[PDB]
């Protein structure tokens, strides 16, 4: 390609090209106002058009990283607003880009995007482009690793919502639903980027082999391998800020899947007769195909063949990749990480056994090594769903907050509350599902919440136990966290009465925000009395809840808090001994 920018502009079209460039700049530079970005986008886009007209024109042959980085490095008030990035701007490519990537903020702490129906409907109708641009901008800076094409898809849902409703109780629940999809989608992609960063491309491929084999059990190993190879490149590119290349390659992949859908899956038909953005999205979210009737017996190949040790030495990556493909397509009832743990156990067995005198007798029972690995997460999910269904989301979240605060009492209270609340919503999502889909739902979603915690820990490390669980092994991460008990080396956080002291401000809050305040106090209760049982803590929190409900129902709210509060604060400590 004579001009890469021209090529991507021609492939993607202007609207998508501008959208993706806006996303990319909003993620690299998270604090800049919407005007600093829009101007940069418009200027970049004008240059692309010029280059599309004449690819020999000066600067058109430069790399995307060079052009985009140079643009970012012109931004007004760079050192004051983006101290670390200004340092990156002294470098050449690709060092500069790598510097930009190293400095993306996963916890930027900006205001919650609260919907104002009247104000936004008014801004939408006067200038939709600006309004929809703003949505891309607001979400991108909040979620710096958000999948670029996915955000454009979600912007179009945002548009349909405002197009439908504006001509305001229509609008609020539509945006609530969309926000949950943004949260989930953001968490899924961040896991992919986190996997590249912390474990590498092999780990992302193995994860993808397992997942895609589950989704497309009809497809042969060549087809799955093909799709995994291409999908891994798409994510590598999107995770490293190469959003034009990422979008273009995602579009080509969707086309290939759809051209070969009879070979791949019967569920793709609904997806494949749609527009480019919608198509790629439906495929990424597609449900698992029905099991084929001709799935092969695996014992003969992987347990009983006499030349297995030779296979493992001569064509290791293919023998193991094939096993993972075969075992995964057969087990849609397993979580992805379980499948990965199974694959690692299979590999370790063929190392151990082949170094013995008589290997066949050794590796013959290899499938029986999987049994305890399957039973552990099955029991965990049964136990957590039993609790959820008994006590409901709020108390379930509370139990998880206690559980995780005991494991990592050095973690910040907002982080512990966030993660406990997220973990508890997994119950609501997964426990009601058909019984065979609970395990994959529960563990896969758990992987997302644990990765969020790990990502926050990269920025703000407080705990060696957390470091170990986050960095030792991607497949073993959930069981590593599950095996943590009360950190015995923790010295209890000192008592501050005011931490547990409530005031009449709580009464005006929305329900979820009242809960967060009480849940924060719950975390703090555990930090000061780490040996207190979950049953002690539930009772103490019950008493706090009753006290809040009483004084919020009072004629004089603050006199109630001022009278009743200090007694409850002192007595509650005696209950936690
Ligand atoms: Zn090229
Ligand atoms: Zn597009
Ligand atoms: Zn500026
Ligand atoms: Zn968000
Ligand atoms: Zn989505
Ligand atoms: Zn993807
Ligand atoms: Zn790149
Ligand atoms: Zn053989
Ligand atoms: Zn799910
Ligand atoms: Zn207060
Ligand atoms: Zn409440």
From Swiss-Prot:
Entries under Gene3D superfamilies matching the protein: 1.10.246.10
GO molecular function: DNA binding; enterobactin binding; fatty acid binding; metal ion binding; pyridoxal phosphate binding; toxic substance binding
Residues engaged in binding Ca(2+) 2: 11, 248, 252
Entries under SMART domains matching the protein: ALBUMIN (SM00103)
InterPro entries: ALB/AFP/VDB, Serum_albumin-like, Serum_albumin/AFP/Afamin, Serum_albumin_CS, Serum_albumin_N
Residues binding Zn(2+), per UniProt: 65, 240, 242
Modified residues (N6-methyllysine): 527
Listed CDD domains: ALBUMIN
Record-listed N6-succinyllysine modification sites: 557
Tissues and organs where the protein is expressed, per its UniProt entry: Plasma.
Assigned GO CC terms: cytoplasm; extracellular space; protein-containing complex
Binding of Ca(2+) 1, residues: 4, 237, 242, 245
Keywords for this protein: Allergen, Calcium, Cleavage on pair of basic residues, Copper, Disulfide bond, Lipid-binding, Metal-binding, Methylation, Phosphoprotein, Repeat, Secreted, Signal, Zinc
Subcellular location: Secreted
Disulfide bonding pattern of the chain: 51-60, 73-89, 88-99, 121-166, 165-170, 193-239, 238-246, 258-272, 271-282, 309-354, 353-362, 385-431, 430-441, 454-470, 469-480, 507-552, 551-560
Residues recorded with modification Phosphothreonine: 81, 413, 415, 539
Biological process per Gene Ontology, one example term: cellular response to starvation
Domain Albumin: 1-179, 180-372, 373-570
Phosphoserine carried by residues: 3, 56, 63, 412, 482
Post-translational modification: Phosphorylated by FAM20C in the extracellular medium.
Similarity section: Belongs to the ALB/AFP/VDB family.
Job of this protein: Binds water, Ca(2+), Na(+), K(+), fatty acids, hormones, bilirubin and drugs. Its main function is the regulation of the colloidal osmotic pressure of blood. Major zinc transporter in plasma, typically binds about 80% of all plasma zinc. Major calcium and magnesium transporter in plasma, binds approximately 45% of circulating calcium and magnesium in plasma. Potentially has more than two calcium-binding sites and might additionally bind calcium in a non-specific manner.
Listed name of the protein: Albumin
Lineage: Eukaryota, Metazoa, Chordata, Craniata, Vertebrata
């Amino acid at each position: 390609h004579k001009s890469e920018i021209a090529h991507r502009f021609n492939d993607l079209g202007e609207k998508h090209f501008k959208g993706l460039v806006l996303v990319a700049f909003s993620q690299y530079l998270q604090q800049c106002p919407f005007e600093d970005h829009v101007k940069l986008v418009n200027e970049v886009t004008e240059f692309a058009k010029k280059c599309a007209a004449d690819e020999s024109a000066e600067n058109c042959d430069k790399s995307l990283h060079t052009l985009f980085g140079d643009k970012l490095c012109t931004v007004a008030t760079l050192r004051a607003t983006y101290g670390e990035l200004a340092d990156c701007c002294e470098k050449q490519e690709p060092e500069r880009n790598e510097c930009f990537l190293t400095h993306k903020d996963d916890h930027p702490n900006l205001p919650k995007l609260k919907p104002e129906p009247d104000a936004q409907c008014a801004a939408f109708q006067e200038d939709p482009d600006k309004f929809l641009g703003k949505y891309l901008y607001e979400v991108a800076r909040r979620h710096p690793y958000f999948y670029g094409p996915e955000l454009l898809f979600h912007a179009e849902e945002y548009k349909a919502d405002f197009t439908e409703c504006c001509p305001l109780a229509c609008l609020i629940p539509k945006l609530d639903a969309l926000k949950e999809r943004i949260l989930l989608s953001s968490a899924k992609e961040r896991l992919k980027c986190s996997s590249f960063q912390n474990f590498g491309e092999r780990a992302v491929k193995a994860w993808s082999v397992a997942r895609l084999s589950q989704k497309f059990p009809k497809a042969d190993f060549a087809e799955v391998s093909k799709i995994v190879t291409d999908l891994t490149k798409v994510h590598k590119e999107c995770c490293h800020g190469d959003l034009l290349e990422c979008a273009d390659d995602r579009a080509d992949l969707a086309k290939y899947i759809c051209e070969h859908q009879d070979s791949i899956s019967g569920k793709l038909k609904a997806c494949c007769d749609k527009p480019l953005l919608q198509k790629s999205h439906c495929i990424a979210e597609v449900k698992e195909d029905d099991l084929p009737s001709d799935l092969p017996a695996l014992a003969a190949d992987f347990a009983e063949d006499k030349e297995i040790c030779k296979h493992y030495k001569d064509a290791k990556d293919v023998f193991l990749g094939t096993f993972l493909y075969e075992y995964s397509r057969r087990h849609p009832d397993y979580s992805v990480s379980l499948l990965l743990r199974i694959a690692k156990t299979y590999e370790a067995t063929l190392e151990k056994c082949c170094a013995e005198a008589d290997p066949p007798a050794c590796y013959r029972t290899v499938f029986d090594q999987f049994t305890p690995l399957v039973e552990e997460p099955k029991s965990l999910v049964k136990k957590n769903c039993d609790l959820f269904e008994e006590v409901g989301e709020y108390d379930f979240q509370n139990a998880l907050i206690v559980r995780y605060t005991k494991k990592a009492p050095q973690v910040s209270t907002p982080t512990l509350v966030e993660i406990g609340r997220t973990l508890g919503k997994v119950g609501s999502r997964c426990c009601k599902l058909p019984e065979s889909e609970r395990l994959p739902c529960s563990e896969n979603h758990l992987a997302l919440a644990l990765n969020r915690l790990c990502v926050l820990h990269e920025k703000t490390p407080v705990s060696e136990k957390i470091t170990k669980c986050c960095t030792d092994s991607l497949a073993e991460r959930r069981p590593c966290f599950s095996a943590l008990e009360l950190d015995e080396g923790y010295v209890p956080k000192e008592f501050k009465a005011e931490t547990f002291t409530f005031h009449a401000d709580i009464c005006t809050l929305p329900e979820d925000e009242k809960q967060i305040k009480k849940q924060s106090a719950l975390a703090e209760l555990v930090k000061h009395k780490p040996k207190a049982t979950k049953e002690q803590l539930k009772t103490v929190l019950g008493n706090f809840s009753a006290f809040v409900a009483k004084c919020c129902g009072a004629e004089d709210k603050e006199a109630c808090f001022a009278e009743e509060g200090p007694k409850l604060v002192a007595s509650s400590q005696l209950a936690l001994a």
